[PDB]
């Protein structure tokens, strides 16, 4: 009766990664991590990555659009597609028994779509809907405009399909995108609550199609732009970033610590942030309610770092300038050796409880197994983080004040400062 098991990893001749782990949980969760996304779109096929993840329930070469939804729901299972600008995960959850059942539809969707022209055409207007509900949160507005103002290509491409290309994505563009990117050396069959010998058997004696590395991406050229949206909303969102560090970078951990030094989102419900020098530093400058956190993204070949301020209209200027000064003062040395250790503690915490969930665990395993075909022991990831000096943090702050900034802000920008005013 159940005990402590190890995580296993296998690399097929295909270049395919199989990262499994048995935890004896009554719920299995299998995913297919793929290096796809809008990062590989060009001006000719914009939005084909968005339509692609909406195209999951469409007919496949082995399962009808009917049987996919009906067969999965027949066993309480669920199918979902999460994707960023340069990653694509196809997940399935179900009871331990009906793994093989739901595994079929998962395999059919990712490795054998048909993209029937009439089904594709009928799906096109869902782009309008899915975008409209996601854009209800003002952050996705400036966050998409940020990448547009930060880069020139690849990462500059929007995560949600642009309006002008809705209904104008061909069924052939979906086929080409899957053929060029969903290749074996770019994917990983990652499972949880499954024996490795089974997950391995499935990946080879069922899963194949185009091998190799396929279409590559033009590495992200930096721009440094200033996109501003005037929409009269009483609240003004604003983001200011420079080039950060990539995934698996040396300066990667240094920025994450600087993030918690400045502070990233309250840890106490309805609570002020004391550890946050950013939250506090702005609070001294403005009177009214607001939010100001540290912003940090790490991509494969680049990254962004800075601050995001949700503030009132006329007090946007006060908050933004104050939030800027906090990174200036942080670069001028204003970082206690305890602040680092306190941030290195907050960070080691955040990481650990994030992997509590089934989503967090499968993602964390599959993320690394996809890029660097290994899983790092949680003790060593705890080593790599607190092996960051106090100087490394002040250095990361120095790079912000020095580097070329790119700003995205949407709201009533009547009192929102331009980028050449910071």
């Amino acid at each position: 009766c159940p005990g402590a098991e190890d995580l296993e990893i296998t690399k097929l001749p295909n270049g395919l990664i199989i990262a499994s782990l048995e935890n004896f949980s009554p719920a299995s969760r299998i995913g297919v991590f793929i290096k796809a996304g809008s990062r590989y779109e060009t001006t000719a096929n914009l939005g084909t990555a968005h339509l692609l993840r909406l195209a999951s329930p469409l007919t496949t070469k082995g399962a009808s659009s009917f049987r996919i939804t009906r067969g999965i729901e027949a066993v309480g299972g669920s199918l979902s597609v999460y994707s960023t600008r340069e990653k694509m995960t196809y997940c399935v959850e179900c009871l331990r028994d009906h793994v093989d059942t739901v595994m079929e539809y998962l395999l059919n969707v990712t490795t054998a779509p048909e993209f029937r022209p009439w089904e594709v055409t009928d799906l096109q207007p869902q782009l309008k809907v899915d975008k409209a509900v996601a854009f209800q949160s003002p952050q996705v507005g400036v966050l998409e405009n940020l990448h547009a103002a930060a880069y020139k290509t690849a990462l500059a491409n929007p995560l949600y399909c642009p309006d002008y290309r809705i209904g104008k994505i061909t069924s052939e563009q979906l086929h080409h995108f899957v053929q060029n990117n969903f290749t074996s050396a770019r994917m990983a069959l990652v499972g949880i609550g499954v024996k490795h010998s089974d997950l391995k058997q499935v990946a080879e004696q069922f899963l194949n199609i185009r091998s190799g590395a396929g279409t590559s991406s033009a590495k992200a050229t930096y721009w440094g732009g200033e996109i501003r949206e005037q929409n009269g909303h009483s609240l003004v969102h604003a983001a200011v970033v420079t080039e950060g560090a990539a995934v698996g970078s040396a300066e990667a951990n240094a920025f994450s610590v600087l993030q918690h030094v400045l502070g990233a989102g309250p840890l106490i419900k309805r609570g002020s942030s004391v550890t946050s020098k950013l939250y506090q530093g702005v609070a001294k400058a403005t009177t009214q309610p607001f939010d100001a956190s540290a912003f940090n993204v790490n991509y494969s070949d680049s990254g962004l770092f800075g601050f995001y301020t949700i503030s009132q209209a006329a007090h946007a200027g006060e908050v933004i300038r104050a939030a800027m000064n906090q990174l200036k003062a942080a670069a001028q040395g204003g970082v206690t050796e305890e602040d680092v250790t306190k941030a290195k503690n907050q960070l080691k915490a955040t990481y650990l409880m994030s992997v509590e969930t089934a989503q967090g665990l499968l993602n964390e395993i599959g993320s690394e197994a996809l890029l660097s075909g290994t899983h790092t022991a949680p003790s060593v990831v705890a080593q790599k983080i607190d092996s960051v000096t106090s100087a490394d943090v002040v250095n990361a702050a120095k790079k912000f004040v020095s580097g070329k900034k790119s700003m995205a802000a949407s709201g009533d920008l009547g009192s929102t400062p331009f980028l050449d005013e910071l």
Binding site: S64, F66, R67, R70, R116, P117, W118
Partner: protein, 101 residues
């Protein structure tokens, strides 16, 4: 035994919708299945079907037909809708079976 081909080719000419310049699938009665299959047709094939039908309609009100030269040959008849119609039926039979079990 080339008998079956003899009989089909005979009926095709005896039917005489080729005199109107109509394909076999043009004369298909549009029930729920045919209606759905038609909506799956590519633009070009659909716009062409539309003209052939409107031409047959115009001919019918004239009580005239096309010249013998413009009659659709039996071997030149394109079953353009039949592959679509078969999948529409196959899909439906699946649902009807899946809703009983």
């Amino acid at each position: 035994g080339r008998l079956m081909d003899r009989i089909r080719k005979w009926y095709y000419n005896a039917a005489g919708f080729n005199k109107y310049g109509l394909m076999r699938d043009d004369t298909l009665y549009e029930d729920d299945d045919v209606k759905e299959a038609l909506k799956r047709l590519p633009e070009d094939l659909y716009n062409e079907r539309m003209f052939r039908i409107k031409r047959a309609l115009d001919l019918s009100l004239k009580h005239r037909i096309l010249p013998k030269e413009q009659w659709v040959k039996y071997e030149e008849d394109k079953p353009y809708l039949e592959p679509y119609l078969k999948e529409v039926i196959r899909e439906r039979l699946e649902r009807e079976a899946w809703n009983k079990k």
